[model samples]
Target: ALLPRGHTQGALQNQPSLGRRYRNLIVFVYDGFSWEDYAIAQAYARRRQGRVLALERLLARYPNGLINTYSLTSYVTESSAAGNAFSCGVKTVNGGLAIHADGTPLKPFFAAAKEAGKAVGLVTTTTVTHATPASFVISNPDRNAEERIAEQYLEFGAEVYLGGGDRFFNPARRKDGKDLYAAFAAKGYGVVRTPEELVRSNATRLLGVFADGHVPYEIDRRFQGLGVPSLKEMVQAALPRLAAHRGGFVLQVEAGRIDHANHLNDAGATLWDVLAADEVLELLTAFVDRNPDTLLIVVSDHATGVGGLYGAGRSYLESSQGVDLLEPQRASFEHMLRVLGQAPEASQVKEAFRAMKGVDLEDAEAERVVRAIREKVYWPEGVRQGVQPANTMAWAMVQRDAQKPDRPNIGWSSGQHTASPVMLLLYGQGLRFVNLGLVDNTHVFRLMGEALGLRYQNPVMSEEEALEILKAR
Candidate 1:
């Protein structure tokens, strides 16, 4: 049965006998990727002569469907709650990590895999200790407890932990003055700090922390010639090392920056990160082609930015050829937006746009863009407070499109996450288990547990139970 519902335990053990079904379990999470994002990409794909790239190929080749991503407390799912739902199979409150709001630990899949003698790894474009990545291996009541999250990684014992977030590890930047890098090195981890160092090291236990915060957005990395490796590069490096284990491995790959860009309403960066994830998928598909036993699951935690296609004029029902006259955007100016958004003065806007987008903005045009950015309303003061700079840049890009509607105009509902379902694509042994149409995010946990032949007892409390637990707190 596809994801036979109920508590499972006996199936979780004796993994060696399960052979390949237990050998390789790889999950790819495109944070904040939604159907709307795919819709835009599909339109772009049509423009590119129906080129079957990674995402396009997945839709065409795999058995895929929509997944409901609402959380227990709210219709809109935050990354922490959504990440936990799939990882631990329980609904936690927003900002709760691998634990319930009451701090009850929900064991993740990696614990099962590790106990069953499988290697486990997590790779991402964000800090290794970020909400999505941390959900797979660590449990915490607070998502922002990054220092504690990093400490948990050592105990959780994933063979590979690669991504950015050096601030959490470096003694210089950490408020607590702990040298996590030294601690990891002392634990026999082959710690590396750069792409070159990562490639040269063959340490069985590898830890590569590449940046201070999250890695640069893919577009910015390309435009600025950043030294950090691509998402594909990190995955390519991880796959072989993880594959060496006879019992197989559970590895999670995340293009976390897509969500970050979406939160900022930076379409250009979001699209590029999606494309970068596509490249990583290309590498994964090739590996899976050679090793058919492996299971590849690509999914998204939730929808962000409500990005969709809209025209300045004409409704679909009103006009015979509604919105058809609007051309597909051939390029994106997110990089220029980033620069102008960061500029301290209005004068920098025109120069930044011209330099990054190769499009000259006349005095009036530049003034409008700058004014819109300056006057843009950033909502939910809580969420956008720290990200105002990036949000301003996103506003600039939006205004640019609005002023020049003839150019690419991608509509955004808000910088906040939407209560929209995301897509799920499953390939390999367990694909037959899930029926198509709609599904809950929790189904993913059951599917993976069943496929891996692992017994899983969900720790997520019911609403009434959760209320009692939270009331005591």
Candidate 2:
């Protein structure tokens, strides 16, 4: 049912005029999504014979392969660099957005499309101005400058912006006390807040901020009665409005929390978001079926965790059963920690697990949780910071000793990214132009540009260019 709206041949309002063939480019970018991530989600998802999942079905039908996700500085790149690579067709250092190593702005594909009179936009589960979304439109020396990033969205002249970071826009939270909501409203943007409001509004130039921060992970939102639009619902709102453009549109959709959950090594939180992204993919595939001019590229910004399915038990039998453990998880490890408080007793740990995870914790497991809550030295050290010990232990229980046997199927090399090739699936127009097998992440910008028949100014500084510019300074 996610079909493109009927275009009037004589009216000119419904028709698309972007490229000679392609009319729209819709990209679904997943933060820290890897092949193993997809495999686990597909095994858990509802599926039919032959076509294991939407991703599986699409890959079979389209030009699909893997792409390397390296940055100018790092082999295991973060979202900003990976996003910049795909968006600007340039290699930037880690933590850089759409800017070069020295703070020079590079033109992203969206800006080129906007110059060509095409509607350009992005939506995500994270704040709209977060690194991934920000990289596609604006230039920033630092990815963490959310307030400056939010300002750049307005300055860049993006037509549609939807996501959660109300903190940057709300006057009460901003240090300078500038209400970006009012500013957006002044500039002809129909700014709306709640999920219900997002559904009813028909404004082409629209802005929707649903949460004060990142939208709740799908698991938390579902079980905790939190109200936020699903990824598919948000896309449903975007597509029709963007389709109103005479020169077609360029859109990026991100399931932002998949990376966050993976960062915490939480299976329940990670897998459900993967499933949520798949539903959106299914919706878009239907849309692409109806409108062949629309190019759909579902790719990951980077790989996270370690290995696929992993090997549970000696024979790999328990691995299938390990997938079932995620089904009963009612809340995230984060929620469980909040329930446990700063100082938690063993019984409290047991209760929190029983309440949130739907599994009875063993006496020894409770002690482990208690020690984790006490912030003792971790056993298997986390590769990155930002994850709490209690949360890490709970996620470990999900992967290891949950409901007996200590299967420990899944693996996490780090609470961060891995230097792995990302999976890529390309559909709709311009398949013949791009070499679908093992492409560079920078090639994505070229692919989108070639599909749109627009040439983007990819301002990249080569090694020779970089060494000379800074040495003179």
Candidate 3:
């Protein structure tokens, strides 16, 4: 049975002491996770009546809520600006990370924690060199210039790092033909390439690079057959490696591909990434149950692809649309699509339907829908055609297609980031930091600094002046 972790008696770690009560900090970033995603995951959890699904149960097990985490710059929604805000706790232009447009270094809270003697680690579903993970490790003027960032990863004082992007480490792939893997190996960091090697590595200072590009999402890792560790497994595996330090550890695990999937407008893929994040949270929650002092902050850089109840209807206007679809299917819409993507014919659909629920769908209309789904050979496979008006977007699309094909709200406006508020959820020692009530993006750094008792020299403002100004603002 699952049990919640209660708050510990104040061990009272302080800035002066630095390494005392502060042990572990897990900043789990869910890319493209919206305020609505949590609601949908929560409903799914409630239906299971236990913490059966990873995310649903984790949310149920902890005190969680929605926060308006958004881009500090207008129309700048990539992981770059969002990553800078979350990691460095500052607002910069789009494509910027851990630095101002003028190349001033923005200090990340984790760096401060590291300076205070805490072991620092970073893990992500995207490439290790991606903007979100790289923001804290490298101070750069351009997030798109990933090669420079990859080189800087070793220069950063990070103790442990894991994710894809072997190309950055391979000298053959570099413009300057520099093999960073050899450099890292020389620096006492164990540089690993494959998933198997990473799983076997028990190094004090480790570097796991799994792919040439971004690693596969959980859905791809499962339904598709990518031989990579699930994000949860990687995070769970990374804990002890990071916690080996006597001063304790701070590791950031990002469900990084969720943002990319959302930008692709692949809803199912995004949810799978979100589920992967939840799985990590479930394990973290279990860890917290034993060690209550660990501070865990689960949040998003920004929202993407206009997720959540996006249509005109009572149930459809909220994230409850997925909840509505899951009722009859008893599976997530994403899972259903993955199955449908592989199913052969109408009979195969019937077989899948029977497998999903004991009841066999027998209507001619159902058969036609299944046939349409089977006929979809392309990537999207015109799956939207198979989806009925009952599905939220499908229903809205039907309405819009029936009326005006050029309408905005009916279908996705773009396969890109939307200017939407993300969420912030805390557990264990994290609850103390969230008490500033509602706050802007900068509050994340402030809260992190306070939570760990790190003497923060604010990334955006000086420490003492920031506290007073924040109070006045």
Candidate 4:
């Protein structure tokens, strides 16, 4: 559970005591998860009533609604701004990481909690230095400067941090040639590189770097023998370690690859990651069941790829207007394409599909996947930069074309984010205090602060007297 150990008496160890209602907090930021994705995931969850889907059940019982994800600089917010809004309770220009538009640092919720003697941790499928996770610990003018972001995690003092991006910590890969793995270890962090090491480390402060880049997508991890822990397993490890803190704990678990898959217009990978997050939700719900004082908020930063159902199959006009119940085809377009790039000349592509997804690709479909891999282009700028030449963009376009006469179970607008409201589900204590209707992303920061019995500190005000002057109105 999220509650600290030996705190059954409702007092948090010898630390500054927190109210029973405000002891533990867990926030889930499903990067790039949107309203349409929520609808599809919920429909799938409901259709499989015989199966257990935690997200579907969580939203059913909790006070949930939608929130606007626009950043101060744009209507369609990117991860940096949207994440900063949630972490710092201030709206900043897009690409700003935990800083004001003018480049001033905005103290994040994790910093506040850590200062107040709460054990804080962050778990993500993306590199811990990625935008969403970085927003919680570092302030930067640019989100892409991950090497600099990597250094801030130790300075911020999160008790436990787990995710990918060993490259940023490796002296060979970092531009500055600073070996952050050793740096963190020197600072009392038990640095680990694999799941086995992560599970066995007994350091009060721990750092687990599972991959050189973002962790493998859930679909790939499940069938391809990836060694990283699942989102659920990461939560299981984080909660117990953080529970050792006396003043309780604050943690954020991010299924960040959901956004990455969506950015590539790969629905299979996206939904599988969503399901992966749901599994973690199930774990947290069980934890909260034991410790009701814990406040859990499952939310998203923004919408990506505009994923939704386009229409029915060819026979739809003759029959029902409602959607036909069908799950995504096994395997993801992204993973399949990556495999094609590895061995372009082989007939083994079909065999790979069967081995990974339990489905057979048509002769033409297999050919198209090969062509997409062989003809991958290099985009020099924009989101596609450095990801082209065997990237998922070309593969996703081919997959969209493959869904012909029969409408695809899923459709995407483009390989980018959209201005859509995202789902927000709150569980445990202090649910009634938040505005549960359509609200700005900044309100999330307020709600989270309120849940922890912490006062909101408006960064723009700059002074206690200034804040008092504004509140006097």
Candidate 5:
């Protein structure tokens, strides 16, 4: 163990492990969110704010839920460190998952649950081996080494693994010439590559590989005829097999691509995935209602897409027709770029933007986008810079701050995760112990450990030590 030694029996610490109460522990993580993300999605769901949307309903149901999303190294965290804060109960440096800053395994919750004879699994929209999903199952010094992470899966012990990532699993694509699919088969995993197969699957040990890399954006999947499962469908498929374990189970479901869309500042894509995850939460809410013995918690790892959605046109005087501009959106910024290539002509830009987003792009806007594409740089000086020109196209299409009269009121300051804290909603078992006020991200891991009747005495760090270590690294 990389963690500092636990206190002796006589030296009492904060709460010790309470016995397991919930028969199953289900954690649903939407990769990025903020106050505005929630409000925009809720408005999209019901234009009048009827509070009928799943997110609003859950917020009302569990009002005392709030979290402080921060990391040891940076004010704004990347997914890896944010993930570890919840997975291993530590404030490790960024870029590592379930490992301490110096590269030692700090017992992951999956291992803790598995050692206690419980089934453990994780499902996500990104590759099953992405940081947030991988954090729960494996410990590593590097999050970018996905090929290595795939290998660790074979040695690790997670019963159900769902989501995209055939790129790492298919031997034909690997540089090492190892057949991980075959290897998983040898380990008694029933691997299925399609949503239909996932639905028909009766395997106790399951592996559903839906895409080659991260799954397609929920918006693009619809527009491009891509056949990938929604976050809801993946969760529906995994629950039965996990619940079959008589000794109880622990599972995490994440809408991981929500962060990807946020990073691109792609409003339509981000909103669509946020809506997709909202439905996943809706599905789980019903599941919890029927299975009262299960604990269901919903939260975001961190808020991304700086500035968030806005109040347009004279202080909420008229809420209509602003966000609804993208009501006809068909293609995600990702799909539009894949089809348009690195440098598209002004005519191609205008035609494609109109067809995909249902908004006509003027000659100058189209030309500006094409110029950035050819130069391979972000345009307009300060808008969604440091990203693909395609994302600049997304920014120009949505942001209202450009000197134009008709530009929409929406704004996104940075195409990255922010230091903003996120909300945490919960149901089942001990809701009272969960302080509804400001709580650290590591507090989430404490709740999970409590639910599983497991204990994890992780390492500690002071501000000066953390600052010194992070800078030295």
Candidate 6:
């Protein structure tokens, strides 16, 4: 047997294993949050350039929760299938929410948790009725179909609903003139609009809708001092009331804008959002410390816009520059959002950059970003410029001088999701139910259900046997 070295002890002997005390479970999703982006984000954080994702702090507390998620099929560009997979327990085609190909709705575990009398909360930087948040609450054959999702959100009576998507319910925005906020408040929820109102309101059931569409990314939002609480603040606000239920709570928070940035290929946005995602996790750590009866599972639905630190065929940072880019920032994504969101125009964007504290980019770096927008950032295929090349931003800057308009030194592969193995990080009590070895992503649901004393009947199981005992009821 190998002997211990220095302060090192046995692999399992030195580490503190999972102890059973968790009751509430919080799942955090960073849309298009690539695994490689982690190191880059950290580097940025070190520079005090801006706020980085909050997950790093939480990872320090429980690295076991770092998970590599996977897509159900080869085509996973849309959020519908990925959202469904995480909310339900299976893979599905792009654009399918909680329903199977046969048009049957799969019951998501959160709804099951609610049936089990657990408090349920859903928060996202995008619309509340968007695919990512909607899957857990409503099942629709077409995930993009928002009208139905809105009606379903009110119908289900979720305890806490925060994030954008006011138009679906706002009389001024909705075609049907349904005052969803008023309707929900009438039903006993404390409906709020601005972040100030949300922070001040202490109602048991809260519905905070900040925007009509998606909430602006951290690279843009925080600068306004928009008064909207950051993801961490939102999570902090959620826990107390959730715990007051005594029946426990299940909260799902998504940095849904990650996918939007990925689609735009905006490296800055992606990194900042991921950093914001990290911040949310950090908030949970403090909560977990106090509420020992809470179970925290951090995982993603499926990897979107498959990004690699380096191209799959070559070593990372070796093909072009030996220096790594995608480093973490010190400030959180919320900070960046507040800064960049102020500048929608090119001139304003520059002025905002100059005004932002701790955000320093070299003249060459700025030039490179601007050049990308003018040229190669888009293609004949209709992919637009700006905010899309998140994982590649640094590399693009380095190779900007080497760019060949005719041959373009950049090697862009898929701008969408590809079939790849996802990672999973598990921690807390009942984690024993989750096998550590590389396994199918679906196992996450089964393991989570098992730990809660809930049943997860496999699709392959017999009809009577397939019926999971509804413990959540």
Please give the CA lDDT of all the candidate structures: 0.74, 0.77, 0.62, 0.72, 0.78, 0.60
What TM-score would candidate 4 get against the native?
Answer: 0.82
> What TM-score does model 5 achieve against the real structure?
0.91
Whichever of 1 and 4 has more lDDT, that candidate is 1
Candidate 1 residue-wise lDDT, 1-473, digit = tens: 13345434322221221223545789999999977677665565455435655688778867787677888767898898898888887787788787887777888878878999889999999998999989877788889989889999988888899999999999999989999889988888999888898888889888999999888877777767888988988887788889998878989999998887777666666777887898898888788778877888899888988666654433433221112222222223444565555333556876775555444556655665565457653433325333544554444444243333533355566777888878888776545544455677877787678668875876656666666666787
Model 4 ranges off by over 4 Å: 1-21, 46-49, 314-330, 342-372, 376-407, 430-435, 461-473
Residue-by-residue lDDT tens digits, candidate 6, 1-473: 23347525321223233434446777776666665556556655755455444555545544343332434334343577677666676665556677765566788888888899888999888888888878877778887678668888888988988888878878888888877778888889998888778879879998888887877777565544454556766666676778788788888888887767655444556666776777777677667767667777776655545433343223332422211233222322334334445324445434434454223445554544344444444222333222332322333333333322111122323455444444455545444543354455555565557556555642322222212221222
Supply the TM-score for candidate 3.
Answer: 0.72
Cα TM-score per model: 0.84, 0.88, 0.72, 0.82, 0.91, 0.74
Task: Please name the candidate that would achieve the greatest TM-score relative to the true structure.
Answer: 5
**What are the per-model numbers of colliding residue pairs?**
9, 0, 1, 0, 1, 63
Best by lDDT: 5
Q: How do the residues 211-243 of candidate 4 rate in per-residue lDDT, one tens digit apiece?
A: 888988887787667788788877888988887
Evaluate residue 106 in candidate 6 and report its C-alpha lDDT on the 0 to 100 scale: 83
- The C-alpha stretches of model 3 lying farther than 4 A from their native spots are 1-21, 43-67, 70-72, 309-413, 429-436, 458-473
The weakest ten consecutive residues by lDDT in model 4 span: 10-19
* lDDT ranking, best first: 5, 2, 1, 4, 3, 6
Model 6 has an lDDT value of 0.60
User: Per-candidate RMSD vs. true structure?
Assistant: 5.9, 8.6, 10.4, 9.3, 4.5, 9.5
In Å, residue 427's CA in model 3 sits off its true spot by 0.6
Better of 1 and 4 by TM-score: 1
> What TM-score does candidate 2 reach?
0.88
Encode model 3's per-residue lDDT on 1-473: one tens digit a residue: 22235413211111111122446778888887765555555555565444566665445555454444444436436677677776676666566778765556787767777788888888988888888888766777777677788778878758888898877778988788998888888889987777787778866688888877888766667664667878876776688787677888888889888766555444445556766777788788787667767877777777765545344455344323444443333333344456666454666656654554223455553455454455433223334333321132222212232232222222333455666656666777434333322345555665577667864563453334433533564
**lDDT, residue 205, model 4:** 82
TM-score-better candidate, 4 vs 6: 4
> Arrange candidates by TM-score, highest first: which order?
5, 2, 1, 4, 6, 3
